[PDB]
């Protein structure tokens, strides 16, 4: 498929695997919002 | 000092510089509470 | 439509107007994923 | 003691008890850093 070039691309070292999964959820959250930006104004 | 056994160490790609600073903030947030887990709750 | 059984309904006092808008953003974030829990993951 | 001028005070309806405990955790997180804003960064 090859996705287009999105915004920049940084990284973050999250210590502790427990809190790691927690941050991952927040990442996907904002990710879906960005995809809803190109969606209808509704 | 600091911590004997360090937890795992993963990483996360944060697209977008604006949202990046947002996640980094939460990172130090949880890290602070971790240092408070040393002395019992008071 | 929307959702048959609504989950519980609590509340939270957010001190500071600046940080307030920050939490509200995460609120709608999780709410969006909840609506996606209807159709299987794809 | 504590803080002279308290910031504003709003509220937020968190649907779902599971996600509720999640937001509450981040609440105390930012509150802790606020108390550290007293002494310069070190």
Curated annotation (Swiss-Prot), chains A, B, C, D:
Crosslinked residue numbers (Glycyl lysine isopeptide (Lys-Gly) (interchain with G-Cter in ubiquitin)): 33, 39
Outcome of mutating residue 25 to G: In sporadic cancers; somatic mutation
Induction notes from the record: Up-regulated in response to DNA damage. Isoform 2 is not induced in tumor cells in response to stress.
Cell location: Cytoplasm; Nucleus; Nucleus, PML body; Endoplasmic reticulum
Name of protein: Cellular tumor antigen p53
Positions of the UniProt region annotated as Interaction with HIPK2: 1-42
Function: Multifunctional transcription factor that induces cell cycle arrest, DNA repair or apoptosis upon binding to its target DNA sequence. Acts as a tumor suppressor in many tumor types; induces growth arrest or apoptosis depending on the physiological circumstances and cell type. Negatively regulates cell division by controlling expression of a set of genes required for this process. One of the activated genes is an inhibitor of cyclin-dependent kinases. Apoptosis induction seems to be mediated either by stimulation of BAX and FAS antigen expression, or by repression of Bcl-2 expression.
Organism: Homo sapiens
Effect of residue 2 to N: In sporadic cancers; somatic mutation
Posttranslational mods: Deacetylation by SIRT2 impairs its ability to induce transcription activation in a AKT-dependent manner.
Result when mutating residue 12 to H: In sporadic cancers; somatic mutation
Similarity comment: Belongs to the p53 family.
Result, substituting residue 13 to R: In sporadic cancers; somatic mutation
Residues of the full protein shown: 319 to 360 of 393
């Amino acid at each position: 498929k090859k996705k287009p070039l999105d915004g920049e691309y940084f990284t973050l070292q999250i210590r502790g695997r427990e809190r790691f999964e927690m941050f991952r959820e927040l990442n996907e959250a904002l990710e879906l919002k960005d995809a809803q930006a190109g969606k209808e104004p509704g």
